[PDB]
Design a protein around this ligand. Structure first.
Ligand code: NA
Lengths: 297, 298, 296
């Protein structure tokens, strides 16, 4: 597989191999090694249609630490799909660089980019999904809980791109995934069915978060968005009361950025069971392993 | 000469030497060599007044591949000519960096930048011209046709910056250059006359594209960019598959990009086997690496 | 001290050591040495809430010349304080990078950034001050005059962030600092008082620029809507003011300069104007600051 567009475009064995490599390279850098430079002489164009801190800094820093140079093409720099068609961007950037990262709106834009690029394309968020975030989240779970297999992950909030990539992961690792979301804001039926097709994981969609969280290893949230949404999502804030219902085993996770007072409270974000900051770090370690894999290392 | 602002600021021999080095260094990189790093310890500030993919990525990637660091100063980062006068930007950046690349509006802003900079200034496109693009074009022609000398290049569209740098090249290499443009949209008379003064090339301005393309080695286009009067005038100047058939069997299609299919050119032409727009785009990096090597004494 | 937020968060000896190292590393680079790379394997996130040429290019280029990679986070990239709270930005970037630079609006934003960052934070300008600029200015003065101690520095203009960082310097090196500012455009009373408490420098706030400049070693300006124009009548640095200052006076301006507003063309381009060497020294002072913060 040339590209990393969705986690279940790979098989179980490949995903676990990449998560093992993630731990190895992370250990190497944590040791202070700065002389492992597999990407010496390689470049990455990073196309960003939207703002970013974690995706941007993790990819640019990681590429640097492994010996390469990443270019930051911001929203107004190349304007993929408006100034210029995606197939043309793909064919140009594939002749300058060795790998392309892209954060876009319509998922089809990243499919187009991958289809027309002769180099690997890595997804850095689309309207549909966010696979590198969940790869990081899996690494974070392995480090804190010990493994992803047989855990209960409960996402509370909008049935959105994060939920889509949780479903991707549930398609290659057997665990229990629940999406507790307001009626009308459920994840894509097709994406839910594709996870069920894999037959590994117990997949539940519910509108009752207070029940869903019971026994969770992970309570996950993200931004909901719109004053209508605020109205629709009353009852879906992750607060200390909800974490108490979830139980003493439960970690709190959030891809960030977080809007305290909306989808989550300050008390939850700052609590000892919150692992949002190690989670954010692990974007760089998971993606380093992903890029290594795509480039034949 | 300190700067690279126009191709015919240099003589024929020097231009040909740059294009030879472009080939050599391209071949080195294609071999997989990453240990020729003459720009180690060197920096380049890249001032961009406008959006860019090709110029941006080619300059920044190539500078990296040769060992240096290029800074991207976007349109809102330093705001040359608005937040700060060009003479002051030139004198500050010349003290930080080893070379400056600039994409601006008024040509005079690039001349000012060069005049007050103690380091070399490279032109990354102005209102007047686009010399690094045509250097890359020349490399592409050498690779596909064999040579630039003795060819017939026919540009179809607005008599604009790309035409100006075609006229620059025609001042230093002898070939046949035809600009087929709507009446009213001719290139600058002084630039046309400057090419003719050099006496190397046959230079024609015409408003009949269907006659102009006959026997071309290259048919070249660019985005056209009262709006209604212009729309009217450019009827007949789209490069379509019919025009390429009139051009003949030895014609390549070139376009500096971005292309707007359905405007200056059709999908079928851009994607045709005779279209060399993607190799052309790559060669921005290789031509510009040779230019920068020259300017910094390599 | 983890961070570089204000010059007088450090003592006199440490500031002098930093300025000494600034000279040494500048000499090394001027020699053509490109093999001193202490920042190999290190990264710096640079958060910019506002446009910049000198701060941006000096930090990005100098971090490169010392072996590291600086990331340019522009105003719309992370939107610190709008898309996401400073304490969260701090905690995330501290896990990716080795050092953070930040140019912000409210000074409290850079204090919050430092308080929640486990890595050093360098100030690249706030509404309150601009310490890296004055460190560069101090280097420039050492190279042109010989030293900062015992000089007379006269700032003419708005009592702003530049004046605040001058008062910071006047708290750790003994010199004579005058701010000639319009009434109601004085620097912060607390910042003046803190410099006087240090007891090293003679510090004067005046409204009479023609008298203040007399005998200066340095006449300093910076960029200063309609009503404000009225109050700054008499505060422009022109050739006549520089004549009053006398033959010892250099002109300095942190830039960008708006000729015809706070300064004339003739002053900016005069032989006594050292604005361009001044700007270069942003890189050399900041290199030494970053070396200090990172334990070199
Ligand atoms: Na590749």
């Amino acid at each position: 597989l040339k590209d990393f567009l969705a986690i279940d475009d790979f098989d179980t064995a490949t995903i676990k191999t990449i998560l093992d490599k993630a731990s190895e390279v992370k250990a190497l850098l944590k040791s202070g090694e700065r002389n492992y430079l597999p990407f010496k002489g390689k470049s990455m164009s990073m196309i960003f249609a939207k703002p970013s801190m974690r995706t941007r800094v993790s990819f640019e820093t990681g590429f640097f630490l492994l010996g390469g140079h990443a270019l930051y093409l911001g929203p107004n720099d190349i304007q993929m799909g408006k100034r210029e068609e995606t197939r043309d961007v793909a064919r140009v950037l594939s002749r300058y660089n060795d790998i392309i990262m892209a954060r876009v709106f319509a998922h089809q834009d990243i499919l187009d980019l991958a289809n027309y690029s002769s180099v690997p394309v890595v997804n850095g968020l689309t309207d549909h999904n966010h696979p590198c975030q969940i790869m990081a989240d899996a690494l974070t779970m392995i480090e804190h809980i010990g493994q992803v297999e047989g855990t209960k992950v409960v996402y509370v909030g909008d049935g959105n791109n994060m939920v889509h990539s949780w479903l991707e992961l549930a398609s290659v690792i057997p665990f229990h995934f629940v999406c507790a979301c307001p009626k009308g804001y459920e994840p894509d039926k097709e994406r839910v069915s594709k996870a069920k097709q894999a037959g590994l994981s117990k997949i539940e969609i519910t509108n009752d978060p207070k029940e869903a969280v019971i026994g969770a290893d992970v309570v996950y949230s993200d931004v909901w968005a719109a004053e209508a949404r605020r109205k629709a999502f009353q009852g879906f804030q992750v607060d200390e009361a909800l974490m108490k219902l979830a139980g003493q085993k439960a970690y709190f996770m959030h891809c960030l950025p977080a809007e305290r007072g909306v989808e989550v409270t300050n008390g939850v974000v700052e609590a000892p069971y919150s692992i949002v900051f190690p989670q954010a770090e692990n974007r760089m370690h998971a993606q380093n392993a992903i890029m290594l894999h795509l480039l034949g290392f």
